[PDB]
């Protein structure tokens, strides 16, 4: 985090309230801020051993030197709502083999982890091949 004017100040407070209020809110007040799909995941779910992640983040954030980010906490979980408390941590997210590391911004809140790590090569081409049409055939 090194941004400005994306969740406080002139230009942008997160739906009319700063980050500072969010951290003191419970999930209950927080979810009522419009983002419909989020509200399912909280009201139904209520912690199905996401315990393992959220303690490591706070822990590592605490022990890390001031003006320096922690190491990483890794996940195979690509699903979990990005939240204000999570911000400032650094998380590696499993793809099919690779843990792509990302810094968490206060501007990413509401989204999932898995949107910030891709799981395919964008694509290049190409040079059409042989049978790539109604012409390829014959040899002997």
């Amino acid at each position: 985090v090194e941004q400005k004017k994306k969740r406080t100040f002139r230009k942008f407070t997160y739906r009319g309230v700063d980050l500072d209020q969010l951290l003191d809110m419970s999930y209950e007040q927080l979810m009522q801020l419009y983002s419909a799909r989020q509200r399912r995941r909280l009201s139904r779910g209520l912690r199905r051993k996401q315990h393992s992640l959220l303690k490591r983040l706070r822990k590592a954030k605490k022990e890390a030197p001031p003006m320096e980010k922690p190491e990483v906490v890794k996940t195979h979980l690509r699903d979990m709502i990005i939240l204000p408390e999570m911000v400032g941590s650094m998380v590696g997210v499993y793809n099919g083999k690779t843990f792509n590391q990302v810094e968490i911004k206060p501007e990413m809140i509401g989204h999932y982890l898995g949107e910030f790590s891709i799981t395919y090569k964008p694509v290049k081409h190409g040079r059409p091949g042989i049978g790539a049409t109604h012409s390829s055939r014959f040899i002997p």
Binding site: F12, R15, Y34, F116, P122
Partner: protein, 145 residues
């Protein structure tokens, strides 16, 4: 009868007096036909005549009833935008401000650099759609020697 005036200019788009009132107004972006048949009735005027038959006094009221819809008791769900996101309110966006707002949300999703902004910048479909047989601009491919 009624030779008084025809084509005119209003905010950001030129609106003809040739067409009926509701349908004339739709040309302005952020206003569909569904949005206009409401706003005319809140203004309590005919929609059964042409747009060139409105007076200046009348059309002055139209834009006020349009741009403060909550204060003239058009419901929140009936707006374009409910809690924009990071602005904190219900809003109604019209022609040249719509584009400015739109370009921000594109920029935002490449700022965070989600899956969205990458698909935008690459010029590929955002939503769940196959691109294998969808598109073409391109198709000239050869392989012989």
């Amino acid at each position: 009868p009624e030779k008084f005036q025809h084509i005119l200019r209003v905010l950001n788009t030129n609106i003809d007096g040739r067409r009926k009132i509701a349908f004339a107004i739709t040309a302005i972006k952020g206003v569909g036909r569904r949005y206009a048949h409401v706003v005319l009735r809140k203004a309590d005027i005919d929609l059964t005549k042409r747009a060139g038959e409105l007076t200046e006094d009348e059309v002055e009221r139209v834009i006020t009833i349009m741009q403060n819809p909550r204060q003239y008791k058009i419901p929140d769900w009936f707006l374009n935008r409910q809690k924009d996101v990071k602005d904190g309110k219900y809003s109604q966006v019209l022609a040249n401000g719509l584009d400015n707002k739109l370009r921000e949300d594109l920029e935002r999703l490449k700022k965070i650099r989600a899956h969205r902004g990458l698909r935008h910048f690459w010029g590929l479909r955002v939503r769940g759609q196959h691109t294998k047989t969808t598109g073409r601009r391109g198709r000239t491919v050869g392989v012989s020697k």
